[PDB]
Amino acid sequence: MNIFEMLRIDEGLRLKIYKDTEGYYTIGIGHLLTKSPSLNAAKSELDKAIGRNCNGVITKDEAEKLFNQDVDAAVRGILRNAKLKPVYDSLDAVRRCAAINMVFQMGETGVAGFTNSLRMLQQKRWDEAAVNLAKSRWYNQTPNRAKRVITTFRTGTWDAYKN
Ligand SMILES: Fc1cccc2ccccc12
Numbered sequence: 001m002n003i004f005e006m007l008r009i010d011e012g013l014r015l016k017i018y019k020d021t022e023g024y025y026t027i028g029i030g031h032l033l034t035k036s037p038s039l040n041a042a043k044s045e046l047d048k049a050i051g052r053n054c055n056g057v058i059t060k061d062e063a064e065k066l067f068n069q070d071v072d073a074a075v076r077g078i079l080r081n082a083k084l085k086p087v088y089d090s091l092d093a094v095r096r097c098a099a100i101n102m103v104f105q106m107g108e109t110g111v112a113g114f115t116n117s118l119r120m121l122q123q124k125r126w127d128e129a130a131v132n133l134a135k136s137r138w139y140n141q142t143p144n145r146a147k148r149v150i151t152t153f154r155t156g157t158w159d160a161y162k163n
Contacts, residue, residue, distance in 0.1 A: 001158040003071055003097045007104055009161055010145050013063060017042055017056040021142055027056075028063030030104070031070055074103040081108055087118045095121070098152040105145075106138065121153060130154040 011030030017039070020026040025033040025042035033042040046054050050062055078084045078099065088099055102111055120129035130150045133139065139146040151160035
């Protein structure tokens with residue numbers, strides 16, 4: 001169990017352009033292409049990302065390559081963010097995966113409202129943090145995935161992804 005396996009479970013794998021839970025064009029292992037309603041705009045983003053004319057379809061190797069880039073971008077964004085890095089560095093490896101998972105899903109801007117959750121996590125008040133994390137649009141809109149991530153923060157185990 002590692003961040004790649006965790007996010008592969010949460011995001012799945014699709015080789016043709018699809019829409020994410022918010023209705024946005026996406027491909028691969030949860031790679032957001034664009035928030036624009038234009039499928040042509042999404043196809044342009046895809047071709048730019050892959051480096052060839054894809055017609056909205058990629059290979060598994062390409063999906064996995066984009067995925068590695070996307071995970072790394074989430075990590076480096078945490079490490080460059082003066083608010084997120086201290087909390088991240090206070091966590092054990094399993095809980096760090098839960099943090100990366102959230103940044104992958106929502107970005108640095110999407111986690112900006114989680115200030116109180118971050119404080120509870122840095123204080124290692126795991127049950128309180130879990131309660132606080134669930135008081136969110138994130139939890140209400142993707143509750144099964146949020147429950148898995150929250151259980152990971154609460155327990156520091158992979159139990160939610162083995163179950
Ligand atoms: F503990 C954390 C560290 C860095 C980023 C995070 C994003 C969401 C939730 C928790 C985080």
